[PDB]
Paper text:
Volume-regulated anion channels (VRACs) are expressed widely in vertebrate cell types where they mediate the efflux of Cl- and organic solutes required for cell volume regulation. We demonstrate that the 8C-8A(IL125) chimeric channel is a large-pore seven-subunit heptamer, like homologous pannexin channels.
We obtained five distinct 3D classes for the 8C-8A(IL125) chimera. The 8C-8A(IL125) maps showed no apparent symmetric arrangement. Therefore, the final reconstructions were done without enforcing any symmetry and resulted in five structures with resolutions in the range of 3.4–4.0 Å. The arrangements of the LRRDs in the other three 3D classes exhibit diverse arrangements and subunit interactions. The distances between the subunits forming the tight interfaces appear similar in all classes, whereas the distances between the subunits forming the loose interfaces are variable among different classes. The distinct arrangement of the loops formed by D50 and K51 is also observed in other classes. For example, the class 2 structure has only one subunit with K51 pointing toward the pore, compared to two subunits in the class 1 structure. The groove created by the distinct K51 arrangement is located between the subunits that form one of the two loose interfaces in the class 2 structure, despite the presence of two loose interfaces.
Author numbering:
A (entry chain A): 16 to 59, 95 to 176, 234 to 405
B (entry chain B): 16 to 59, 95 to 175, 231 to 405
C (entry chain C), E (entry chain E): 16 to 59, 95 to 176, 231 to 405
D (entry chain D): 15 to 59, 95 to 177, 234 to 405
F (entry chain F): 16 to 59, 95 to 177, 231 to 405
The structure:
């Protein structure tokens, strides 16, 4: 369960996150494969040129120039992708779970389920003890939940954190992508034990990392666009008070009150999945149905 | 139960997509498990030639000519086929998982599945059956009232099919365009003279002859896929889908008072009647108030 | 499940297909695992010859001759087997997953399964629910017979698929027997790479020659058996009017001499289900007599 | 499953032997392509070493040539024959479950026996309803009309063991005949002189002394299998299978009115009594008219 | 189910056999990885010595001396251990399978269990449902007393299997003591390959010569312990007269001097079972006297 | 099931045994993976020395010195660790699976579990026919068990035997492990007589995985040391409380029923073991041991 509070901008984000994870794991796999750098000593019929270097001196040169000339971005790109995917997924999961605010969600889901299976909605639009108990417990839930600010402000905090993390990711990926290069000009001072001073190196997974970087940049661009749209949606209509106006006109009940804060936010969240549970809640919220039920009882 | 709303074209295209995925992954896995390019210098009884090159200079030349001589298509073909296969998969399944387009579909399928085991159909042409049938009538009436004005369950289908058609066209375009560039032996002209001593090289691409065959197979499969998509698009345009005609049904049933439904209900009725051209008649039975009149007359 | 509507051949050939697939993949296990063609230059007590070649020139020569000398059949043998096995598996399954050709299958299977367990079957030859149960199954039989007794849509596809399978069997035998003799162990390689290696003519050995030849012979045997089974089926479909069925012997045995003789698609499916168990036909024909309707209405009232 | 009751001791013994043969064959195949098969050196028809002056690929060429030009076909393709024959034994031992003729009758028989296996009427009548007992009876009477008409479910079990026995005989024949050709040191005389420089070679087959012991173990296993097959063939012949005699039941029961059946049902009774000797006694009680008449009289 | 019938030595020998299997498989899995032989030619400031041999002549020498210089015991140590361990496993739990050997044990276990908790035993030692239960107990007691008296089918097999285990012990310890000194580190390989390598005498080192040695000792030790247990079993099967049972102490303790002596298979089974628990014997003996039947008949009325 | 009958000192050792097993397998795998001894010849601007040895000469030298230069501890430490851990596990899991002394265990567990939660227990300690009948049956089961168990001494000798065996094993382990721990060193000197085969007589060798073993060795000792202490404590517990006899003193005073007897022998030892887990199961059992309870149930039957 728990999928009812999932607007269209919450499964798309999960798909984007899993795609980013796939990109990162592919990058790490390619990192572990291949021989990485390859360096040769620069000198500054067509017979070959004899460098006269042992088999271990090549390994020494390659290892020294792999951590002396390559830019720090070209060596730790998949790791950064993995870290950012991890933090995005954790931020997505942290809001809902919050070990200490989940019960308010499970009990609310149970309330929605019970109000969904009630067949009295049809009669109201135009076993009594069970309904009375349901009304009493719904009143208890209202009085218990309608007070605090714990389901709106922290959602905004999550979204703002996501947007700022995005802005930073775009910021430093845009600049540090022209430094992923194929051929580099390693220049070290190992002259008394190798014999050569200037070496030219050829990083292998350069173009592939450039393509992966472009793909990752586009995927984030879409993710940040989604999060920015959500934040703007939360900050141009002020979804803190819910006005039950159309329900009153299209239902006939004239005693429909308006709820405020967290319950209003949860109603706002629900309507994206199906704009019909508010119908059941409005029908169940009237005090005249219980009056008629007890009048019939007597 | 979603397979009912899946005509033959949308199982044939699904099998085509699966085959595309398998060929693409085969190519991708074969690419790595191979020695790739191999280059040698050019000298522009028999006795061998002494090049006097080290063991690392060979690797240097190989991995330099790999990215300085080979065409971009010959290197990233499995990746392209994987990407396009993934788009094709998440281009036809998107019309189901979009929020706001799922509740109507599940309600429709529930009503259709339920409106099959009703004795009234047999009797048309005991307390439980009457109340259950009345509940079915009320549910159908309210659902019809629901899906009558907001007609977003059909434009998405045409849009996605058009997207598939245009993607197919471009796929064919630049696969036929750049399929003759996958050659076996190539010439590499890189300027590394003070490092290795040779300026001109001749290279062989190990997987050049296999990639051509896989490209041809992919071209054939995508051509068949595009032909199916064009047929579906044509079927979606040769007569209005936002209306239905219970012409012969009313004539052969003698209940000629049922109105002709339109918009989303009509379109899904067109889609479903292809799978089984009988269910529509069942719906007719549970769209006439005359059945309710018979029920009330029998009760009263 | 969907196993009753399958004669012996349709459960025999199936095994062959999977067997074929195994051979296919088996080849693919080695075609990329074992070391491929090995080539040496040719110069046309005992002391060896110094060719004076590096270790990369050897790889160059090997993978150039591998594609400039070997026949196109010796390299792609497993892939053709895999493709043909897959397409046979597809053709044999173009029977249950084609909208417009599966509704009748499921209807008939469900009706047969529910009718075989009906008590009226054993009561005919010597309650409350059974009344309307038998009634409803009777209208279901009536509507089914009025439904699937006009067009042979589902009998015109079995013939099509079997004919295509026979044609493909012929093609496979033809071209596979044509080129089975070109898989050779030792070959000659005449490529003009002298400015880069110094040697013009090479002699090569293809590592997987005998193994491919033996696998090819096994594949030919399997395909021949497959084609013989398909030929038997084709002969089975044309030696009488398969589109008509007569309820004569059942009437003689039982005594209810009023069940009509069906034709077309339902007759075809009844023949198929008869090729598996000669008991279903009678158990269903007993629900086709007007006298049975009279007995049912007398019992109910 | 529900078909596990048709397994005498020898059938399960043969299954265990066959899985053991498969294990040996897969072990042999695993060792086949994991080592270097052959090692060949040229022959030259103070102590110092002698230099061949051969490259590192001419050794591979020589090894690969002499491996398929000097080794007997038995030493190379040994494990595959073991796998083929184990697979064929597995197939032959089960070619009477999948045939439609035998598949239907076995299922019907097991269903009838299972239905009779949970009938409290038998326990009540022996130790100390209606339609279920009555209906089960009518099935039995017609059951011994469909089954006792020909040799279908019994002819297979006698026509397959003969094939198994003959296949065992031929296996022993050409496996003992060609076990002395697995040599360790062999000679190779190939005419490759203008390419390598040496004409005569001496070769060692690394996996020679192990294939001999594997062959001996395989011969022992197949010999035990063949002894089992001969035992079951003799058991199928020393006394008639087409007839079953209800002899001891008459003395141990006293209800001397049960007739004796023949043919496929007789063979099935033979096998089931070879199984746990408790199904026959339970099933025989549904053949006496006395119990049915008593039940009818009591009910009416 | 049948574990209650297993005395201590059965589980002890089972654990020992499992340990033998463990060490054998450990030896085999160490051999598969690192087992090899290193051979060098012999020449019967400081500088190194040049042998002037390629990388293939070393492999030739190694794999020739590996089978012309190593004793067959060192080559295959763990395979024999595995074979013998499997033989011991099959020898154990052998008499449980060849005969029926399922009813004769399970029924006895069930009767002993339901005789253990019979309230009549407690009533005597200090409705109709109890009467019929006791009658059933007595009648099946007599039924098995008469039925099983046919020979020795659950007794001779035990002696046969113990004897076979003892003989396996004797032979195994014999030839493992005989050959344990044939495993060495350094060996001399005198093979005649002179025109192909140039060297006639070689000295070779075996990798796991000091390992297979130590393991062997451990293995031997385990076997030794095994044998002792088996010997004890033979002492138990040879000293006590298991073919007859004598109900002596019950007569003096209870005073009801009418219980007859049981013999043969039931005597042996009681001798075996009383080891697990010396209380089931008296519970079984209670239901063997005619006075108990007389009391049962009197109470039934 | 087998949880209540396990004091804390029998679960601390359970954790320690698995810790030792994992350390041993870690050592074994790190041994099988990495390279063994590496040896070089000795010569008993700078320029390198050319030994002039082939690639198989070096393998021969390494393989011979690995066995002619290394002390047997540095060679086979981890298998000793594994053997001793397995022996400890066998010792600790002995009396649960020894025929002739295991049936009593589940009999006692079942009886105690049955009488732990019964309405009659609550009713009797406060001051239907089915409940009375089941209580009566449980009374007979307890009465027969008392005579079934309260006569032998087999479940007490085995416990002390296994504990003393574990203690002596711990002593031996610490003894020789401490003795042979300074012989696991890094650089060793190899002196083999091969002059006609390789050309060099004296070699110097380095054992690759030496220091690591030493580290592991110390860890092992610590665990064993702790293990020993635990065993010692248990060995002290058995020999100072007089575990043979059990007194129902506290139960009588806090319940008032002055007819519960003092049990001895095997049953007393089992009660001593169980009350070390939670000291109220004894009360629930003692409820089902009073003739007063039998008389009360007999009266309530009427």
């Amino acid at each position: 369960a728990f999928r009812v509070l999932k607007p269209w901008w919450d499964v798309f984000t999960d798909y984007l996150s899993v795609a980013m994870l796939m990109i990162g794991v592919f990058g790490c796999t390619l990192q572990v494969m291949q021989d990485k750098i390859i360096c040769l000593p620069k000198r500054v019929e067509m017979k070959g040129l004899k460098t006269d270097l042992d088999l271990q001196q090549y390994s020494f040169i390659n290892q020294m120039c792999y951590e002396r000339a390559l830019h720090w971005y070209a060596k730790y790109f998949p790791y950064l992708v993995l870290i950012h995917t991890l933090v995005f997924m954790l931020c997505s999961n942290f809001w809902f779970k919050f070990p200490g605010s989940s019960s308010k969600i499970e009990h609310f889901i149970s309330i929605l389920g019970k109000c969904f299976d009630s067949p009295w909605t049809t009669r109201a639009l135009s076993e009594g003890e069970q309904a009375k108990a349901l009304f009493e417990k719904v009143k208890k839930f209202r009085l218990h939940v309608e007070e605090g600010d714990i389901l709106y402000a922290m959602y905004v905090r999550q979204t703002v954190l996501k947007v700022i993390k995005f802005l930073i990711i775009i910021a430093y990926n845009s600049a540090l992508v022209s430094k992923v290069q194929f051929t580099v000009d390693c220049n070290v001072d190992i002259q008394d034990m190798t014999g050569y001073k200037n070496f030219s190196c050829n990083h292998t997974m350069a173009h592939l990392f450039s393509k992966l970087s472009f793909c990752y940049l586009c995927f984030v661009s879409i993710y940040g666009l989604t999060c920015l749209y959500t934040l703007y949606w939360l900050f141009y209509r002020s979804l803190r008070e819910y006005s039950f106006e159309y329900v009153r006109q299209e239902t006939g009940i004239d005693d429909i009150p308006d709820v405020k804060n967290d319950f209003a936010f949860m109603l706002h969240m629900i309507d994206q999945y199906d704009p019909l549970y508010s119908k059941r809640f409005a029908v169940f919220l009237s005090e005249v149905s219980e009056n008629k039920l007890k009048q019939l009882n007597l």
